[PDB]
């Protein structure tokens, strides 16, 4: 579950490339101002909003990754827990299948 949350959090990353960014002194007012400006521009971006960058020293690119197949993976993990526990899934997952009217009566009578 924690890995799935991290995977969702890391769905998209934006990288800001600046020529000669290594010359800036560490933990000085210039670096603080630069990162404050970066954050401030980051807050005001969006679908209906655009940003402007230099064409000779700056580059802005976005690397994105998809998420798919994790709900079934977690379902398989829960099914393994159910199988090892020894109790039916209706009592432990507290779920209704919804695809059949009165078949889970057999499930509850098995329990």
């Amino acid at each position: 579950e924690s890995l799935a949350t991290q995977i969702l959090r890391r769905k998209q990353q934006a990288v800001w490339k600046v020529k000669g960014l290594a010359e800036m002194c560490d933990d000085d007012d210039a670096q603080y101002a630069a990162r404050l400006r970066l954050a401030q521009v980051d807050d005001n971006s969006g679908v209906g909003r655009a940003i402007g960058i230099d064409a000779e020293t700056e580059e802005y690119d976005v690397l994105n990754s998809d998420i798919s197949g994790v709900p079934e993976f977690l379902s398989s993990k829960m099914d393994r827990i159910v199988s090892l526990s020894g109790i039916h899934e209706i009592i432990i997952k507290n779920k209704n299948v919804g695809g059949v009217s009165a078949s889970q009566n057999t499930a509850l009578e098995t329990f």
């Binding site: 210039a30 101002a33 940003i51 960058i53 000779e56």
Partner: protein, 133 residues
């Protein structure tokens, strides 16, 4: 008008950094410094304003031989002399110092490269903007 003492300090710093400028009349150097004042930004590097304004003025003066002598003839501002030679006395051949590869006009003289390094260190070469709403 920019402060007189700051202009004096900038010209004197230019003189000490390049000793060959000691023979140039002061009015031309004042004009070059005043022209270079239009590009240098003040609040970016307020502590070291004089050093960088002198550096930028020096870069402007030696861009492509913009600064010539008082009695230098015309038509030499568009054409350069590659070589010359007298009959049996002497000969000489010239050439360009370095060759640019980016077309920035700033990485063309050492002083401009120093100025870019100073600007990158003090503030940075970046520009991020957003609309006003």
């Amino acid at each position: 008008i920019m402060n007189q003492e700051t202009l004096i300090a900038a010209v004197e710093q230019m003189r000490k950094l390049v000793p060959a400028l000691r023979k140039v009349p002061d009015e031309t150097l004042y004009a070059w410094v005043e022209m270079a004042e239009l590009f240098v930004c003040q609040k970016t590097f307020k502590d070291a304003y004089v050093k960088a304004i002198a550096l930028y003025a020096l870069h402007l003066a030696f861009l492509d031989g913009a600064l010539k002598g008082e009695d230098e003839d015309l038509e030499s501002y568009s054409r350069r002399v590659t070589s010359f030679s007298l009959s049996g006395e002497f000969s000489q051949t010239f050439g360009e110092v370095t060759k640019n590869q980016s077309g920035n006009m700033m990485l063309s003289t050492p002083w401009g490269k120093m100025f870019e390094q100073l600007k990158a260190r003090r503030r940075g070469r970046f520009a991020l903007m957003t609309g006003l709403r």
